[PDB]
């Protein structure tokens, strides 16, 4: 819907258009794989795990 | 993403970074501060929950206190702590990416009042004055009638 | 080679800069047989992004800050769409080709050393556009300079705006809002929407279509306490009923058709309407806030000067405002939100005795049952009251024999001294429809009572005047009223005034006032009266040369 309709509309400001462009540049499988195990390793933060 | 840290509980309500907004559609209003694009901090207890609840429910792990985050000193301490935590998250690259994604993942807007996102209507405005050829009513400006109609 | 001092400078070279090789990259239109072609654009997104060319010392942040501090803030103005359009009609024999290209504002951060520019950084801010047209024939050869531009050029007049880097108001005590005029623009082209160069035979137009409704008002207060931003907005809404400050849905558009012999250059600016919220007290302003409400633009039409006559390096003017619109000044009194407004719910018939219920000055709102002259004396005339007329009341909700509170806070002062020790009473003509406020000053233990009384004849001659009861007859000083206003003094002979510039002396018979004299010029008068050993002297001010008026009364 964004790629065919919103992206191309010249009567919508960039504040929403560009933010929606970056919102859908991320695949839904990336959000499912985003857990605390990634930030704990990227921050060196020790937390309960089991 | 730069977390705006020049904020305080005594900051004047400029309607640009410090606002007073209605809690959903109840009678309660609360003060919120903008620390990042599309990210706000409200240094007070949540409106929806009842600060005083019957002892019958009182879930386990139940530190309960109705006098927390009441004075403005505690509210300012909470706001500063949240700003510090957001800066800590934003320091590295994973946290910066997460915060940028949060700030750019706006909920999908609804279409125009008639449905659809394709294109709005057109308005012809600003007819030129008459001349030797005269009737310049069609020589004018074209405008998208609902702009940002979503 | 410059004629300045050593150091860094911020220079604006003006608007109307066309980049090199970027001439036909947007496209052109071909029209024929008398048809009219209109090409336009909307500076909103992806064409309002400035082009930076930074030198090692002057980075992007330095350039942006040192340019937006002195000159127009393009970052804020880039979010509001601005439309421009060019229209041209082809001859009804030939064909016409016409193409559009963006123009830019050029800013230079320079570093002058020993009268020599040794380093430069250049910012190009997207301004409006420019259309070049030519009437051609099939097979005609057109000079290559028409299509292709080799070096950046300034189609408009050159400029080098540089900057080094390091009377008597006869009002009454209360709040006033002064509409000071419309068409205010900030200095140094800080509010310039942009410039269009219309060639001969063409037409240009610049439009703000309110696609984004946001507007940027300007505020400047002498005291953040009391006169705040929200306080000034509230007083503006009370005075002129202004409802929208940062929002507007009023489109505007300027269209100029150049003649067939020369070119025209039209510059569009954003304008403001100036409001002054003074706090006039005892003849001098004690607090003043200036509010500039976004108005609907200004269009300046000019012709190009002589070709490269003289480019003069001129310094920027000091930060300020210039009024291009007509000279205006409208003063409207405002109810002080400080005071409480008591209401008399019943229309005063022929006589009323309002019993005053804290000790702070306040307002009493009332209306009369019949248009007539009323005396509004107080208990022994100890508190000197003031009276105001609510502007615009009586043309709306109406109930016979009752007060319909039209919640109007824009009051017009009628009469009444601000002195809390002078003994006086008012005599005012009150209309049945209109609503009136009575300001009671700081009161004390005496209950006091405000007495309204229908005055038919006798005292019906001192209309719209305050009469002070002088019981010590020597001189007396009072707040001088404006020109063509009235004051009165009642006393139990030389009579004149010190500073100010008619007069009439009446004898009271307990009242049944009888005139004894008229047309008495009290301005430094030396005549005598020799009255019989109670008379009322009525004075009309013809020239307010001082805030106060002194009643010189010598036996």
Short mmCIF file of C-alpha atoms in Angstrom, two decimals, chain A residues 12-14, chain C residues 44-46:
data_model
loop_
_atom_site.label_atom_id
_atom_site.label_comp_id
_atom_site.label_asym_id
_atom_site.label_seq_id
_atom_site.Cartn_x
_atom_site.Cartn_y
_atom_site.Cartn_z
CA UNK A 12 1.81 14.38 1.51
CA UNK A 13 4.61 15.93 3.53
CA UNK A 14 7.98 14.26 3.93
CA UNK C 44 8.00 22.21 -0.07
CA UNK C 45 10.15 19.06 -0.06
CA UNK C 46 13.35 17.81 -1.74
#
